[PDB]
Amino acid sequence: RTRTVNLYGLPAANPNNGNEYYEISGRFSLISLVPTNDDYQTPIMNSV
Amino acid sequence: QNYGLNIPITGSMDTVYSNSTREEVFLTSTLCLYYPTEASTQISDGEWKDSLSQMFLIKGWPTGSVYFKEYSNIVDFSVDPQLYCDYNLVLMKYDQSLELDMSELADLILNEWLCNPMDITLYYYQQSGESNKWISMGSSCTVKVCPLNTQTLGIGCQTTNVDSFETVAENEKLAIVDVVDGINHKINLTTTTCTIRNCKKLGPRENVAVIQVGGANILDITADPTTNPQIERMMRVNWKRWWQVFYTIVDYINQIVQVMSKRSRSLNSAAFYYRV
Numbered sequence A: 001r002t003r004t005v006n007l008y009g010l011p012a013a014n015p016n017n018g019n020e021y022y023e024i025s026g027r028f029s030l031i032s033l034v035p036t037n038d039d040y041q042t043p044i045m046n047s048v
Numbered sequence B: 001q002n003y004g005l006n007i008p009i010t011g012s013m014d015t016v017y018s019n020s021t022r023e024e025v026f027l028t029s030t031l032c033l034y035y036p037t038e039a040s041t042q043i044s045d046g047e048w049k050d051s052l053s054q055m056f057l058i059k060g061w062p063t064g065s066v067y068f069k070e071y072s073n074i075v076d077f078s079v080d081p082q083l084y085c086d087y088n089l090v091l092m093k094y095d096q097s098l099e100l101d102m103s104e105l106a107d108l109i110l111n112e113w114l115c116n117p118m119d120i121t122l123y124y125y126q127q128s129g130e131s132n133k134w135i136s137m138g139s140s141c142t143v144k145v146c147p148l149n150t151q152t153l154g155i156g157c158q159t160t161n162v163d164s165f166e167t168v169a170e171n172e173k174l175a176i177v178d179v180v181d182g183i184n185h186k187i188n189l190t191t192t193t194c195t196i197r198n199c200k201k202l203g204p205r206e207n208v209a210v211i212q213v214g215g216a217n218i219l220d221i222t223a224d225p226t227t228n229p230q231i232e233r234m235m236r237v238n239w240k241r242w243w244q245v246f247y248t249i250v251d252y253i254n255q256i257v258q259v260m261s262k263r264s265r266s267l268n269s270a271a272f273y274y275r276v
């Protein structure tokens, strides 16, 4: 009952649309650092 | 000074025999037994130590001289068997599939071994000759060897892939392993539990005697297969009742110690000479 009809978008009036939540799945890769002194790395030693 | 090691002792063939010495060896030595827990369990007692001690006293040993020791079983006694004691008699119950470990224990205690340490993760190790073995003792001694050729590359096995290593004794408490003498080897032995020593075999520890209780004579103390000598210190008595076994021991103790000797005792209760 208004001027604005057939506009593409998503207003903030009722975004949930009766849903408890919107979900998304996927894979999540990470290459972050970490301290590992438990190695105490000088074993690759040459057995002789 | 030496004790006279390189000086001859001219004797004679007409000197008269000096008289008996059984009394003095009884009054000096200390007899000592190693029996399984099964023996006490079947005896169902706890004054039996006292009864046996008094029987030995009537047999001719002073009171504080017979010492009893208990081990759970042969394989568990095999892990560092410390003979804390002077005349050792190891009663040993035979049961099938314990042939090899029982023989290994008999070898280890009957013969004197000079053992050096081994650092498994670092160095390769040979066996010098016929008298050398590797003795591995601990809670779980799984031994996997990889022999190396002239080019330091394993034969039948790659030094990197431990699966290809040839297993030579798995999950024993004691393992006396021989390998072809003159080839370097890489060993993968579970260093947390088991410890492995490079042991030469000196002459016989002619103090401890082993009394097998069950089946036929099987103890091949000599790892070489061409020879299976029978030592007088390896006795074998059939049985049904542990009380009968102990009474036989007490009755015939004089003969057993006459077979054994006292001079071959070491200060350490350890069953080998650790020479670092």
Ligand SMILES: *[C@@H]1O[C@H](CO)[C@@H](O)[C@H](O)[C@H]1NC(C)=O
Residues within 6 Å of the ligand: B019, B020
């Ligand atoms: C040694 O034993 C013999 C056995 O007849 C005995 O005659 C002798 O007296 C003993 N030696 C000593 C010093 O008593």
Ligand SMILES: *[C@@H]1O[C@H](CO)[C@@H](O)[C@H](O)[C@H]1NC(C)=O
Residues within 6 Å of the ligand: B120, B121, B162, B187, B188, B189, B190, B191
């Ligand atoms: C033996 O191999 C296992 C294989 O996982 C390894 O974990 C262990 O560190 C190795 N031990 C030695 C002494 O090389």
Ligand SMILES: [Ca+2]
Residues within 6 Å of the ligand: B156, B157, B163, B164, B165, B166
């Ligand atoms: Ca292999």
Ligand SMILES: [Ca+2]
Residues within 6 Å of the ligand: B100, B101, B104, B105, B172, B174, B175, B176
């Ligand atoms: Ca063994």
Ligand SMILES: [Ca+2]
Residues within 6 Å of the ligand: B127, B129, B130, B131, B132, B133, B178, B179, B180, B181
């Ligand atoms: Ca050998």
Ligand SMILES: [Ca+2]
Residues within 6 Å of the ligand: B220, B221, B222, B223, B224, B225, B226, B227, B228, B229
């Ligand atoms: Ca043999």
